[PDB]
UniProtKB/Swiss-Prot annotation:
Family (UniProt): Belongs to the insulin family.
Protein name, as recorded: Insulin-like growth factor 1
Interval of the full protein contained in this chain: 49 to 110 of 195
Domain of life: Eukaryota
Clinical disorder: Insulin-like growth factor I deficiency: An autosomal recessive disorder characterized by growth retardation, sensorineural deafness and intellectual disability.
Segments of this protein annotated with the region A: 32-52
Residue pairs linked by disulfide bridges in the UniProt entry: C6-C38, C18-C51, C37-C42
Known partners and oligomeric status: Forms a ternary complex with IGFR1 and ITGAV:ITGB3. Forms a ternary complex with IGFR1 and ITGA6:ITGB4. Interacts with SH2D3C isoform 2. Forms a ternary complex with IGFBP3 and ALS.
Organism: Homo sapiens (Human)
Subcellular location as annotated: Secreted
Function as written in the Swiss-Prot or TrEMBL entry: The insulin-like growth factors, isolated from plasma, are structurally and functionally related to insulin but have a much higher growth-promoting activity. May be a physiological regulator of [1-14C]-2-deoxy-D-glucose (2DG) transport and glycogen synthesis in osteoblasts. Stimulates glucose transport in bone-derived osteoblastic (PyMS) cells and is effective at much lower concentrations than insulin, not only regarding glycogen and DNA synthesis but also with regard to enhancing glucose uptake. May play a role in synapse maturation.
B as annotated region, ranges: 1-29
Amino acid sequence: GPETLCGAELVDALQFVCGDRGFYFNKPKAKGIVDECCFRSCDLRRLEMYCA
């Protein structure tokens, strides 16, 4: 669907930013971020807040 690549982008970005630290995840909240950020750009540097 239209947001499938956005879901993949979010999880790939979390993994990239957090690296070997791991990250906090929550399915409904991740869906909320995708809804918010798929069409209109968000700053993936902000994903640092989720790193362990």
